[PDB]
């Protein structure tokens, strides 16, 4: 389970088109001209209520 919100004063939320992502780095082997351990991840999308 994972969740993301957005407030500022007196907890008044704001509506927006969120674009969250969740990735991992297997072994921080320092790029080798092919991303710094940018290993597979499912990104997501949606609107805030």
């Amino acid at each position: 389970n994972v969740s993301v919100c957005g407030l500022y004063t007196y907890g008044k939320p704001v509506p927006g088109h969120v674009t969250v992502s969740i990735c991992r780095k297997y072994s921080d082997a320092s790029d080798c001209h092919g991303e710094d351990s940018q290993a597979f991840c499912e990104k997501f999308s949606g609107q805030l209520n």
Binding site: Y26, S27, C32, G34, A39, F40
Partner: protein, 49 residues
Amino acid sequence: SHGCFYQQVKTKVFQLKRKEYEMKLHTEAQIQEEGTVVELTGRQSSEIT
């Protein structure tokens, strides 16, 4: 009919590093008007030198 199914696949999803050598390619041509599922694990000889 009078042909096949053709396809191009992006190899960057595989990230061919950290010990990667062989890879199998299974199939499943399910013939219509026949409950016949004849597979064929062809070209399990595709390589990365």
